[PDB]
Subunit: 275 residues, 4 copies
């Protein structure tokens, strides 16, 4: 059971938004607010401990691996590894990014998931600005930034960021990113595309804050992000950091070649080749 709609009440407008950078391991838990929902993205479940607990308000996955991630999320839920209230596909509704067939058939395959573009399109000014920069300049926001936009569109007012490290330093992930299954799905480093940049993520985040009037804090003392956004105040909060049981799902799940999966992958192949 997912939520039918993600509704933010006026009484709790705090959101923690986590990337999967090394600083996920170095959160200052004293700086978390008393109440909050959590957003995670992509390979968050690769984490060896529950760095932000077991309750995820929404997870966010990219269209190119959505089939596998949707199944992985359903297994995380069934195996009681996490509680996941909503599942988004991080989308822009641009036909050189998401194929017509992918968008058309999305809800047919994933009836309880949500296309992210349907939420961020409501941020009119920000949405036009990201499309203009994508189309004409080949600049794209990362999932951390996307999740912020989604949070703002859904009516959260204070964002606390962590695991956002702009792919700098020698540790680039708090885990092995080139796991066996990642290698299989996309045959042969796992580094960001040229369309992504620290400067652009930062500009986009500053724009979200200036247009929509929300507050953005950092949580990780020793992270690059904290040089650009203020660390949240140490309010002496405590946290119980729990380990993952040993046979936790720790790699993206593969799918069996059923008639439906084969149909899906056939189509996805055909138009990923075109794009």
């Amino acid at each position: 059971r997912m939520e039918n709609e993600l509704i933010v009440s006026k009484n709790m407008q705090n959101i923690i938004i986590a990337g999967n950078g090394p600083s996920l391991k170095n959160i200052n838990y004293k700086r978390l607010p008393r109440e909050y929902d959590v957003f995670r993205c992509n390979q968050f479940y690769f984490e060896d401990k529950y760095y932000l607990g077991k309750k995820i308000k929404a997870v966010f996955f990219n269209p190119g691996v959505f089939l596998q991630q949707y199944h992985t999320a359903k297994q995380l839920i069934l195996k009681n590894e996490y509680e996941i209230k909503n599942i988004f596909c991080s989308t822009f509704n641009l036909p050189f990014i998401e194929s017509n067939d992918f968008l058309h058939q999305f809800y047919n395959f994933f009836p309880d998931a949500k296309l992210g573009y349907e939420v961020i399109e409501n941020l009119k000014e920000f949405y036009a600005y990201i499309k203009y920069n994508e189309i004409y300049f080949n600049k794209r926001i990362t999932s951390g930034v996307y999740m912020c936009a989604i949070a703002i569109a859904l009516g959260y007012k204070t964002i606390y960021l962590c695991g956002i490290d702009f792919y700098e330093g020698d540790v680039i992930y708090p885990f092995e990113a080139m796991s066996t299954n990642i290698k299989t799905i996309f045959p042969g480093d796992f580094k960001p595309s040229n369309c992504h940049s620290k400067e652009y993520d930062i500009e986009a985040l500053k724009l979200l804050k200036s247009i929509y009037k929300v507050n953005i804090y950092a949580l990780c003392d020793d992270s690059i992000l904290a040089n650009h956004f203020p660390l949240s105040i140490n309010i002496n909060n405590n946290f119980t950091l729990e380990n993952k049981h040993n046979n936790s799902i720790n790699d993206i799940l593969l799918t069996d070649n059923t008639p439906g999966v084969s149909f899906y992958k056939n189509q996805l192949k055909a138009d990923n080749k075109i794009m």
Copy 2:
């Protein structure tokens, strides 16, 4: 004249749902409630007697033979063999099961029929669960189970099942299933696909009951089903079991090669080949 909409009133929420297994011949009529509507599916009219009377609230047919079954149902009605209030196509809205063109043109060809998926999609949790199991695991519910889901979505509260025998024993149909017309339409046994299973039907039925809070009884004392669902109480009800007149329609009707039928079959061929 079909009904425009199937509306269940609070005063009568009982539904009898019949498969076409051998136990259709062995209903304990004393266990039927006083009031009820009846759902039948597929080759129900192959029956040699009116095992559940002449008044069918809805019939349900699979997309692959819908053209012939729609015509057969219109002839059953015109020949006064049955009264049929509604006609559904048992559908899931998955493009590896029902082609885009089939779904797109459905109401164009069959303006007074109803696509079943438009009704079961409202059972959000159950609908997501059947799609997940279909796509990733190649498990599909049988029409008996589908009809239960439809009944629950339309607001029936108590289901009595019969003719559901999970394809076990040596009698598999209370009639000849490989009739001349069945053989012609689909050129050469008539046994269920590997995607269907007793275990899955049962799990899906138990899930419908636990999510939507309805009651499911059996009607056939000597049937496998009764080992999994309680027999309905013997309330001493009586039934007049009527024979079919001799020249009853007893096989699926064939269609003439008109411009419309040829157009339809041409298209259906083209994309059944793709799927």
Copy 3:
């Protein structure tokens, strides 16, 4: 200027519906009611006199010659030959009759015309009955019958028919039907297809009358129709029968090969060939 919507008021529910049979020349004008709207179809303007006056409430044209007839109607209007309040394309929304592209682009080309199927689809029982007979039996109603269905759907209550002669006798049209332009558009008799029949038109008309509870009269004393529907009562009405000026449009207009007409005819060719 066409009407945006054809709205029938309770105070005037009379409609005269004219085919283009020989009996158009033999209307008994004494039998017309005091008040009425008029529907005409196809090559009505071939008439040498204004047999039903100059004011047409709606005209009805077949999809296969709609482009030329739309232009002809606009010229009839511009040249003050008739006043035409509405223009329909007599359609069923069946893809072996009207191509997907024709229906999709209809309003793009003809923004002030109306697709007839959008009106008759509201006659649920009658619409299902004509589709069933078209698809499975290759029986189609003629435009006279279609116009009756449209009238009934729009809320007219009494129909007076004329120019309906079921293609019987030696005079089949009160004019030359194989005119020069008819010959050109559709290169080489102008007789009805096998899908049309007197028996079916009559059955369909009797059905419209029994389902929707309206009255259908004849106006032509010496016509076949009057053997099946009652002649309207001689109420001593009078009529001024006016001649057409000599240079009246008397043949369907041809179109120039503009970029738009060529585009249109290219597409129409491509999928008339498929159908």
Copy 4:
């Protein structure tokens, strides 16, 4: 930030509509009303001085160069050369003018732009008249006329025209129209197509005035237009005519070959070739 909707209030219904003819240089500023919005089209920014000031209520661009003009307009705005409240694509929704894919994907690429046809389609009589003349007679209104129709549909009541000179005389543009970028985008005179005409523009403008009851004035004393529409009264208004800074954008901007631009141009090529 564009406006979400262009809303005309009852208190200000005046619009200045400028073509890019030589008479843009010869506006009689004494004849402008006290209050007004301004519409400009196409290569307006080629102007060497701010002939109508810096505040544009809407700009209008043709589909065939929309990609470049949209980017040019965003740069005019970012560089503070103009303030542009709305951006329209001058469209008719005819598939031989605008491809299906162009219209389908329009808002995907340009989320804050507006398709003009969605506004002028509400002028029912005028819209049917321009489509009839386009399709059957290959007559098309120019952007000046289109902008008038848009203004009337949005509820402006008095139009003042300038820069409309029907491509007559020896000066045809108050600037070089065959600039380097114009030459590149559309490889090798810049004169109007045969579908455009002074007579038709004038007839269409007179029709807008007679159907929708608005007033149309001229502003340029020595222009052809003033022989067909009355010059606005000299009310002794004054105007500060400002020069453009030297490094003003003065040619249409070219786009970089990003994945999105290449995708877009690939598609546009494919179906401009078909049309």
